[PDB]
Amino acid sequence: MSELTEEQIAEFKDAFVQFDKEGTGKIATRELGTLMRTLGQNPTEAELQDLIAEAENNNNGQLNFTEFCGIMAKQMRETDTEEEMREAFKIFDRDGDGFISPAELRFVMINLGEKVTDEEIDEMIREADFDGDGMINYEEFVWMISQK
Ligand SMILES: [Ca+2]
Ligand SMILES: [Ca+2]
């Protein structure tokens, strides 16, 4: 609840209880990675053991919803931001040439679940297509989603 909305808050909140349900809102750090994953951020084996032994050095071994909520919050940046971004851009491209052509953009955004019309497609492309290419570049695409 550092600076979240409420929906996400209700999320790890619901995940937290469903893991405890014993009259003590404190889950074992050894099972912390599970929640952060169920949330959106996937922790690495290494970072897990460090924060785990960490709590065991004072918090006995289990963590409270406060410290956790504080953690999921700080985890909203360990994704290297652009790293996860480039990952998605690649998904639409399909090839990985650095630019998503109409066929690549529509085919992926439509196959996932968004039934977009060609007209809307030409709109997004043209707006970000600064290089004036028949394709969107990571820079152009990322820009578009950074507002729209
Ligand atoms: Ca491509
Ligand atoms: Ca372009």
Curated annotation (Swiss-Prot):
Keyword flag Repeat: yes
Binding site for Ca(2+) 3: D93, D95, D97, E104
Residues given in the record as Ca(2+) 4 binding sites: D129, D131, D133, M135, E140
GO molecular function: calcium ion binding; enzyme regulator activity; myosin VI head/neck binding
Keywords recorded for this protein, A-Z: Calcium, Metal-binding, Repeat
Residues that hold Ca(2+) 2 according to the record: N58, N60, Q62, E67
GO BP annotation list: actin filament-based movement; microtubule cytoskeleton organization
GO CC term, one of those recorded: cytoplasm
Binding positions for Ca(2+) 1 per the UniProt entry: D20, T24, K26, E31
Domain EF-hand per the UniProt entry, residue ranges: 7-42, 43-78, 80-115, 116-148
Keyword Repeat: yes
Coiled-coil annotated residue ranges, if any: none
Protein family according to the UniProt entry: Belongs to the calmodulin family.
PANTHER family xrefs: CALMODULIN LIKE 3, MYOSIN LIGHT CHAIN 1, 3
Its biological purpose: May be involved in calcium-mediated signal transduction.
Entry protein name: Calmodulin-related protein 97A
Lineage of the organism: Eukaryota, Metazoa, Ecdysozoa, Arthropoda, Hexapoda
